[PDB]
């Protein structure tokens with residue numbers, strides 16, 4: 001099926017997932033001199049006080065931290081969004097070296113990694129129905145750069161040794177995703193898609209301007225995970241990012257002047 005290698009990577013995905021070449025694919029390059037401030041954006045509201053994380057899972061593509069989305073416990077509202085979106089999971093994408101790894105770029109700059117907090121629109125009842133809608137998902141994207149350690153990421157780093165290979169999972173309760181945010185909620189927004197197969201075109205992207213800083217030792221640990229399963233040839237889980245896609249007839253809006 002699909003991956004990030006020469007033989008099954010992003011340039012192959014269109015064959016099983018033809019929407020790969022669609023009109024609202026992600027990620028994109030954010031050209032900061034083309035994005036216009038939109039003063040009608042409502043303030044962004046990140047409400048993660050009652051977040052209930054369940055489990056962390058190496059899916060052979062990246063790792064996912066999964067949440068209880070049965071009720072309005074961790075939600076994203078405001079900004080470009082109408083209604084209420086419930087947090088279902090977060091995941092990351094990263095590089096083999098610090099000069100690549102993010103999916104979105106900013107003025108062609110690649111960051112060392114990119115975190116996605118994925119939410120679905122409660123008006124559609126469940127995630128599977130939300131991904132049949134053009135406004136079904138909102139993904140909060142956050143860039144990582146290498147500098148000082150991010151304390152709130154360390155509980156993730158230290159569990160990685162227990163989920164080295166594809167198919168492994170671990171309990172991951174009581175994790176507070178507020179610790180992954182930067183200071184500022186300044187953002188860019190545009191309509192796009194999931195950046196992983198099935199590439200569905202259902203996402204309102206909200207990409208924070210301010211990166212978070214993680215230490216070299218934190219990112220090094222992400223690069224010790226494996227794409228392969230237990231006892232198979234080791235293929236380090238690195239460069240699990242899709243490159244920028246054509247912007248087509250889309251507008252990127254800035255929340256800030």
Ligand SMILES: O[n+]1ccccc1S
Pocket residue numbers: 091116118139194195196
């Ligand atoms: O990378 N990723 C995996 C699953 C669904 C959403 C996202 S952002």
Ligand SMILES: [Zn+2]
Pocket residue numbers: 091092093115116195
């Ligand atoms: Zn993602």
